A paper describes a structure:
FRHs catalyze the reversible H2 oxidation coupled to the reduction of coenzyme F420 (8‐hydroxy‐5‐deazaflavin, ΔG°′ = −10 kJ mol−1). The overall reaction requires three components: the large subunit (FRHA) that harbors the [NiFe] center and oxidizes H2, and the small subunit (FRHG), which contains three [4Fe–4S] clusters to transfer electrons to the flavin adenine dinucleotide (FAD) located in the F420‐reducing module (FRHB, harboring an additional [4Fe–4S] cluster). FRHABG dimerizes and forms dodecameric assemblies of about 16 nm in diameter with a spherical shape and a hollow core. Here, by characterizing the native hydrogenase from the marine methanogen Methanothermococcus thermolithotrophicus (belonging to the Methanococcales order), we provided an unprecedented functional understanding of this enzyme via a synergistic approach of biochemistry, X‐ray crystallography, and spectroscopy.
Further depiction of the active site was done on the MtFRHdimer2 form, as it exhibits the highest resolution of 1.65 Å. The deeply buried active site of MtFRHdimer2 is similar to the structure described by Ilina et al., with a distorted seesaw geometry of the [NiFe] center and an apparent vacant site between the two metals. The ligand‐to‐metal distances are in the range of the MbFRH structure, albeit with some shifts, particularly between the Cys66‐Ni and Cys387‐Ni. However, the trans S–Ni–S angles (105° and 176°) and a short Ni–Fe distance of 2.65 Å, which are crucial for efficient hydrogen activation, are almost identical to those in MbFRH (108°, 170°, and 2.70 Å intermetallic distance). Notably, we did not observe a partially occupied ordered water molecule in between the metals as modeled in the high‐resolution structure (1.45 Å) of the Nia‐S state of Hyd‐1 from E. coli by Carr et al. This discrepancy might originate from the slightly better resolution or the presence of additional redox states with a bridging ligand in the Hyd‐1 structure, as indicated by an additional CN− signal and overlapping CO bands in the corresponding infrared (IR) spectrum. Moreover, IR and RR spectroscopy confirmed the presence of the Nia‐S state, previously observed in MbFRH. This state was postulated to be mandatory for the thermodynamically favorable binding of H2 and corroborated the vacant position observed in the crystal structure. Nevertheless, the comparison of Fe‐containing MtFRHdimer2 and Fe‐depleted MtFRHcube does not reveal any structural rearrangement of the surrounding residues or the ones in the vicinity of the [NiFe] site. Therefore, the importance of the additional Fe site in modulating the redox properties of the [NiFe] center remains to be experimentally investigated.
Numbering used by the authors:
A (entry chain B), B (entry chain B): 1 to 72, 77 to 282
C (entry chain A), D (entry chain A): 2 to 393
E (entry chain C), F (entry chain C): 2 to 241
Amino acid sequence: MDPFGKYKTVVSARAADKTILKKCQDGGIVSAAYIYGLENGLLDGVIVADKDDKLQTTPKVATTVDEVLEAATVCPTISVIKSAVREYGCEKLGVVGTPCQIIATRKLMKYPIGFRHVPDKLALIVGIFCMENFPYNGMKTIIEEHCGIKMEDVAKTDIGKGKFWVYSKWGDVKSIKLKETHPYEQQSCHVCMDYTAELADISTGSVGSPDGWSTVFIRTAQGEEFFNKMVEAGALEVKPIEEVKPGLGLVEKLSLTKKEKNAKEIEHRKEIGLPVPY
Amino acid sequence: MDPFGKYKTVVSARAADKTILKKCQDGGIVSAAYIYGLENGLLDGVIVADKDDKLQTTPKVATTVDEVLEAATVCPTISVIKSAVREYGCEKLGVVGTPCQIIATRKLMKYPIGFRHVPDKLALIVGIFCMENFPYNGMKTIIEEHCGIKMEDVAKTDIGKGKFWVYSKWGDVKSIKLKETHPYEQQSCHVCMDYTAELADISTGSVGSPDGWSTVFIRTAQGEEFFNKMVEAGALEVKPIEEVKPGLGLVEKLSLTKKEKNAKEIEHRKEIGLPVPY
Amino acid sequence: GKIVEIHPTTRHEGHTKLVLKVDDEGIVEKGAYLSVTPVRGFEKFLVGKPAEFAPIAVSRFCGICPVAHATSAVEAIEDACDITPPKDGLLLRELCGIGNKMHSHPLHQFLISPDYVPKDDSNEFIKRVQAMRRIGQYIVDAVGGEAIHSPNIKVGGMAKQITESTKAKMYYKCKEYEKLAKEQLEYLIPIFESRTLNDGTELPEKLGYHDFGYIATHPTYGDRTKIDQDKVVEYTPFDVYDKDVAIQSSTTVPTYNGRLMEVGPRARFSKFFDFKEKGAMALHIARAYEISVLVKRAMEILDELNVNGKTMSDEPIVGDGEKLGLGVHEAARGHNTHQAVIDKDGNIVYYNAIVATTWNIPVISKAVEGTHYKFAEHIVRAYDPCISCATH
Amino acid sequence: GKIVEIHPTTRHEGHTKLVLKVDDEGIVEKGAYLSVTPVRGFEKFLVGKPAEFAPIAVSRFCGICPVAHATSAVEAIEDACDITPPKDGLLLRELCGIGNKMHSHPLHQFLISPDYVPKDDSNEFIKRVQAMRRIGQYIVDAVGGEAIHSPNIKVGGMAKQITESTKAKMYYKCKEYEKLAKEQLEYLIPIFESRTLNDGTELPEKLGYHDFGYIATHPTYGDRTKIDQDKVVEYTPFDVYDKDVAIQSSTTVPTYNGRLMEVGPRARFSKFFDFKEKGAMALHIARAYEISVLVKRAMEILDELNVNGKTMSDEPIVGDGEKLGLGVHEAARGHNTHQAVIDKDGNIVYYNAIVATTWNIPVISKAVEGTHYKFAEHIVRAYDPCISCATH
Amino acid sequence: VKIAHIHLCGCTGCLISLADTYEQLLDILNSVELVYALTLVDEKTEIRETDDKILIEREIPDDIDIALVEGSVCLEDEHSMKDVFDARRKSKIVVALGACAATGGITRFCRGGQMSKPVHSSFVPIGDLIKVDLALPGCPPSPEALVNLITAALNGDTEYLEIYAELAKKTEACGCDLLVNVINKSLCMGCGSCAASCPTRAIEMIDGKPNVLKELCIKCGACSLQCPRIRFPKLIEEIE
Amino acid sequence: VKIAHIHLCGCTGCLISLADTYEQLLDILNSVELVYALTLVDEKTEIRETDDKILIEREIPDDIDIALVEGSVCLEDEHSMKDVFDARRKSKIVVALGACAATGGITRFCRGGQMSKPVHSSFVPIGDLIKVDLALPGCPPSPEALVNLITAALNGDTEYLEIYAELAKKTEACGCDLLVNVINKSLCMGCGSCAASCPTRAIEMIDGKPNVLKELCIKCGACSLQCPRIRFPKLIEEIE
Ligand SMILES: Cc1cc2nc3c(=O)[nH]c(=O)nc-3n(C[C@H](O)[C@H](O)[C@H](O)COP(=O)(O)OP(=O)(O)OC[C@H]3O[C@@H](n4cnc5c(N)ncnc54)[C@H](O)[C@@H]3O)c2cc1C
Ligand SMILES: Cc1cc2nc3c(=O)[nH]c(=O)nc-3n(C[C@H](O)[C@H](O)[C@H](O)COP(=O)(O)OP(=O)(O)OC[C@H]3O[C@@H](n4cnc5c(N)ncnc54)[C@H](O)[C@@H]3O)c2cc1C
Ligand code: NFU
Ligand code: NFU
Ligand code: SF4
Ligand code: SF4
Ligand code: SF4
Ligand code: SF4
Ligand code: SF4
Ligand code: SF4
Ligand code: SF4
Ligand code: SF4
Ligand SMILES: [Fe+3]
Ligand SMILES: [Fe+3]
Ligand SMILES: [Fe+3]
Ligand SMILES: [Fe+3]
């Protein structure tokens, strides 16, 4: 059972821009990459999640650094990919998504029936690690009725150390056991066989790296060229993942735990005759 | 090859009401039956074709004698059968239709999925003989560009003696060969295996009987009871079909010609894999 | 003490469970009645659909009381869009709702007949119920187009005029229904007043007592000006059940000014007919009396109706995407609320439903306390619960 | 004498046949050009559909000029409903139509290149056409959403604003297109003026001459006030063809004041640029010059466009079921007319389309007379026929 | 013959349609033995008393002859899934009663997110999970259709039931079925009976042809069941 | 490899999409031999001269390797019927090019009555009459998809083509395909790629789920072709 898919290198990294690091709980790789690209003409638009005051999200085509800094539950990022290259005119588009969204992106590039003049405009495809997603009202139950915190009082949410975390605007930090959140997961997530966004140009997540840092997989030539430009310009700080704690072993465990679990669900669905991707 | 389906008796008949006979070119059986029923409480509503000044037709639920006398190309009669028993409140509904429409009526009575409290409200089901139908604009081409007569100048149209006939409001009568009209027929008519409306309570047409008279098949107990009431009341004049010219032999020929021809089309469709009713 | 769980409960619509804590004598100390029906999620899937689809979809909350949801939906959307249904459309719409209730209340009496009607009377009793239901459903078929999910209930009024003949047929049938209702009432009232089951079990005097107020806006239709919707707040199961039970509940918890409220026939009778009796048997009694109120109003409507009156407003289905339209209707089981925000293209921006049994479920949880657990299902059934309604 | 039948004709869109009566020397005495394409029947199946579906459906008349039909459709429906598109929406809509024509005219030049372009020049010629088409389709993709069937063309205006960056990219491309167009014009004009085919065949002087007038309402967009639609009457094939040929024809026969009329680039050039040359070669010449007119107007629009201007009217799609809305547009191949009656619910009561090539087909029938039958297809192609358009 | 009503994610309207046999319902209920129906009878009650709990459960009885199954299956609800499989296990004949059970119907539009079970989002017709022997479309099917189906099942009228046995193999329905299988195939003769069959009035006859108002279609299948140019078995030709 | 474009009841937009390879079209046309395409070449011309008539006909040539067939078949038009069968007879590989040919597309809504051929009312995808080897959905499919399909056919990349070989067996498509096969089956993860694929903008993502505006759907099949929870062959996992 392959744990990470194919990649060229894997490092721990974080944005060198301290203002970016403040707006992100992890290494801020997506924002750093977007901003570096926009500011140097390597990207002319980037897809971000524009949430409202209720944690309700909406994908948006950002074209300025300020918009990226404002955008630092399902958000259908791929739904704006055509708008991005039509009325927004983007020719070097940055895309961000969970593994399933990166899967959708590779599918549309390979079989582009409804994607006239889209595939060649995708200049950087960034995947973020993902274990599961929740319907909004499922997450709302977790935070409000199991953690006892109002959604509008939320400034940071996180998963780690076997717990779900809510960081209140007013300073409080509350956490519960991960087993209490399982009943609220999107059950479509239970056939997902991709933890580290294996098909991205660059994949990034918090797990494997210390606080304020991200584990980054560089996978494709497009990803490697971009990442090397940011490193050479000083836009990222990079350390070997072998030097950081907890390290790549934690990423492997979580990825293999996901694939083992969801492989069981895929077989079960096949046994009772429900469809699965093939 | 059975020619007429099942029936109890077959006669030549015409309305005794001379005003009805004036409004109909044939024996006026449908109007006579509708009017007799309404006037005696055997029917409380009847479905008629309400055409506009352009020969464009619309089915309508009639509840008065006058409406029937006003209504004396496809007209979807069965489309108002539910309205008839809901907001019109009919409990003894008269239905008229071509053979395919009578087929649809027997189907809905036997498998009444979408016909809650409809079947038992059908008190008389009258079928009219039919060889083929035309799209309106196909018939328009026949009359205007092959017969040279404006549609708005049409007061009577008829088929017989191997010809299509247009009777002008201004007195003229024009006719052409039936072979010239064949290209304009509704090709859905070419799988139709029913000439005399074999599934009706009472079936009636002009063929087989002299001018001003109709061939009438009495088929069901419901049809026989109704017809006998009209005869006993004097609402119809009746003669044996064996006594009239051209007689039942012409009906047989035309019916068998239709079934032979359309049987060939059904087999052809099956050979090339197009669907047919079964 | 012991836990008593009854699952599923029976002879009401839909899927619920009772979870009771009882003492050694079996007296209920803490009650929980809850829907465990799956959430089909009508409020969420209506977002993005055209306004006209709302009455079609929400009718499918429930096949017993579908008129109630179609009516609340179209009233909510009309309020959102400032559409006024014409007067004869409103008469037809109320008549449709009354026809639905004229079938529902006898149906409920049929559902409870194994508890209250002697076996030797059952056949005659059921024949009478079914004779009454035939007339109720006839009204809904004629005016609404279909008795079970009425397509004629539309934003703007009612889609179809009836003929003068259909009006007279409905009138004849209403007169026959009134005679049947008299017989049904004189038969059942003595039974409900006897406080005895048909097997001889004596009912406790305080059966089903509770301390909550009532909501009803009208005796036969609905009136949005009689409720302050800003004071209606929906809480979660975790606010009224223990955690192990709250995670099972499928419904929201409606409150008015922070308190639970009962809805239904006894609510209406307390607000409009000076009927203040408490307890569960008083619910059956008010429902039985309400049958007469309903058919009397139907005949009053028939007298007033102009069958050539306009039935649909020509006003366009155009909202401003901001106003929260309010549609209320007195369903057979009580005050029924739909809400909608409509945009300039007539599409649904937001949708919400607070249904009669949604209100009564947490009331029932309390009502079953204080008496033996063997009476808990009898208290449940006094409320004529519609769980698919409550859950939508 | 002899009958000459050519079927199908080639290097235009769609399926047509030529039926010619010629003398012993081959000179055409009586001409018939006719569509034999099946009638998909858009005008009939639009009845009963929502107004918004019209531009989506009629775009599928034709994948070469789909913008023309979406534009005429939305203009007809806006006229029916008294909707005024906002000024920047109208600019974007005209820009979309110009982008479509900026691809179509070079495409036509490609289709005729086997007749007029030497083989040794063909590769370079086609590369230039395709460079120009790339820019035309880029404009339609950006403004219309898709180059082939543009969903942004809607009743009320245009669905999407473009950004200032996209406007500048279009401007850059228009400047490159203008340079390519200059090269294309200086290359082709001498050929069209030479009256010689690339195989040396001399063209007769009176090739394609006819005696009919012209309809054009605008040089680049359309203007319904420039045509009296009451004087446009559609006759049948039996009015212009012999019976054996008339029964094969799929199209109607449009007339103005009882007469046939030519539409297209030469019509526009005669009405607006003082270009009065007759015959078939003058059609090619006017089309070639029109490419420059188009890109100049596109750049003028880009200068005037406010990318933050409102693009869709908030006016509701409500008709009175009576007014016959009129939508006209100068398609690449000519004056294009859609008509619609819209009811109060925004649904289509009646729909009609009279398309550019519908007008030109009976003109071509006459134009091919008087010269050898070997030139008849060259006269056909001068008109850039779109048969799927003509038939719909 | 032992019959049961199994209610999954339905609205109970299909059972009410059965109840709209009115007085005749008593005749129907005397020609069969109704052994299970949560809405109507207190079966099958099983009590499990321990020291701390009394559990009073109503279970589906074994040995059902005919199961009338109404509603669709919620894939994310364990009880919904258990009940559909239990109904199949315990019954010799399974009827998909109504559109929800037969083809999904209105529940095709469910997509989750609503309190108090926001995870409930995937609803399927029962035949996506179990073998279905007969399927009745409509929303709801009429009382008359139900009477006919029960009568035929009791009398062994396999010929009458064939059309519904065939329907049980198809778990999707849509107004565009009329287009795909009739209009587009040169079979529609314009009778208009489909329009009269539709419970939402989604079909309008225009110029002799059906026009489907797709945003009003609830995928009930009544129209294609009706169309006589799809199914017209010879038994319909036997008239009084 | 000899290729032909056969145009039935289409709009020529699928051919224009091929033309929107722009300069690359010349490369494409040099990797194959275009032997028939009424819009582009004067083939295959056959002259039959008698005493009274000269008949100059353009026929489909025999021995085509790949036929790109665009448009649906009009059942009431004899030439339309003849051409679809002739294309199949003369070609080794038939591609249903675009929605009209593959699943009917916009022509599903045809219902006749229009001058000057009011009898023309029944339109079907080509696979309702002939064997189809590959089907490309969309209205039109993109130039990129067409380049990929031609390249794969020339290189014998059967694995790449499998998804389109499978599509050739299904002659119906609809936005409700996303509901029936993904949302209702607990598979939709809300990526929104279906919405971005749709040519008419009929799909709107709401709360993470696709909402289909059915009256805007033209039955092109682009959305279900895209959805990665339906088809996701392993070859897509091979990245640069
Ligand atoms: C549901 C979910 C589960 C996750 N689980 C894990 C996990 O188990 N382990 C782990 O190491 N990381 C996980 N992540 C990723 C983690 O939360 C960070 O997003 C990741 O470290 C990259 O953040 P960054 O600091 O590098 O980027 P930043 O600079 O913070 O930018 C983050 C980017 O993510 C985008 N984004 C936000 N929400 C979404 C969304 N719903 N869909 C798509 N894009 C979105 C924003 O638009 C933004 O551009 C998960 C993310 C999600 C949404
Ligand atoms: C397309 C067509 C073909 C026919 N072909 C033949 C034929 O080949 N031989 C033959 O003997 N008779 C044929 N008839 C029947 C014939 O024209 C007369 O209708 C028949 O003699 C009965 O008329 P009547 O005088 O008895 O009834 P009347 O008293 O004249 O009443 C006639 C009734 O027919 C109804 N009607 C009219 N048009 C339609 C329609 N399109 N669909 C359904 N109902 C309609 C009217 O509502 C009216 O109630 C055909 C009819 C049609 C519509
Ligand atoms: N009565 C009733 Fe319903 Ni089935 C409930 N509860 C609706 O509003
Ligand atoms: N140009 C053009 Fe079309 Ni294909 C034609 N003729 C449309 O209006
Ligand atoms: S677990 Fe898989 S399907 Fe679910 S959100 Fe994450 S990447 Fe998507
Ligand atoms: S020929 Fe048959 S299908 Fe055609 S109209 Fe007459 S009865 Fe109907
Ligand atoms: S088919 Fe219709 S009536 Fe029957 S359960 Fe489903 S929604 Fe209710
Ligand atoms: S029932 Fe069938 S044949 Fe009759 S109109 Fe409807 S689709 Fe056409
Ligand atoms: S069109 Fe009407 S009858 Fe046909 S499936 Fe849809 S809702 Fe049911
Ligand atoms: S699929 Fe679309 S673009 Fe291709 S022929 Fe059909 S309508 Fe034209
Ligand atoms: S592409 Fe498939 S998984 Fe993604 S949102 Fe659409 S239906 Fe759901
Ligand atoms: S929803 Fe859009 S992409 Fe899907 S079939 Fe319909 S038109 Fe095509
Ligand atoms: Fe970290
Ligand atoms: Fe006669
Ligand atoms: Fe609710
Ligand atoms: Fe036209």
